[PDB]
């Protein structure tokens, strides 16, 4: 989850 969120949120 967090890996996906962090990637998403940085973009």
């Amino acid at each position: 989850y967090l890996e996906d969120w962090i990637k998403y949120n940085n973009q």
Partner: antibody
Amino acid sequence: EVKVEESGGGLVQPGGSMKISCVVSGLTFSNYWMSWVRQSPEKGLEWVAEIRLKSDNYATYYAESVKGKFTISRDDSKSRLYLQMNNLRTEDTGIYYCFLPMDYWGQGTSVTVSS
Amino acid sequence: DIVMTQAAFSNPVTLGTSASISCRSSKSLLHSDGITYLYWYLQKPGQSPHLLIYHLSNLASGVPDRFSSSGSGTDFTLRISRVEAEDVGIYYCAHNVELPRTFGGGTKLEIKR
């Protein structure tokens, strides 16, 4: 500011269906994960469904409560999120919010399931 | 699933004094990036929730400096340092570390007058 506005609530009988939606303005809708969160006395704030982006093949996620009953979808061209809600029970009564995690909530649209 | 625990009510607070609203989570919300993914929302009567704090202690844009927050990975506290009458409402905690997203049951602020 960013504005989230739901519509489509009303009454339906148990075992029936509803389809609600929200339009989001003030940002580029297609670039955001979007969710539905409902509110009721018994269960308080309850996240029910979520959808990611075209680049994620529109991956969807559901709370166990509603798996098999609800389908979330998005039309990026209309900046619109949908929730198709089938085989409803009285406990599906509540105020339904679009929530753009983690920043933005709509005004809510009310859904009553009753005979 | 993470359980977020909040008391339904707080001790009534006199205007101009400090109120503390607590929350705890059943799992640590501290991530390996050093961020604790704990959020606070306020829902005023007749309204939707609105974001106050993100990542444990950061104020959302336009939120007054009267609001602050800290915590561990599991126990968190929102402070309203000089309460005003308009702050009445229900304050909710939420995590952002996994799905399903879950919320605390909400703590209603009562003003003492």
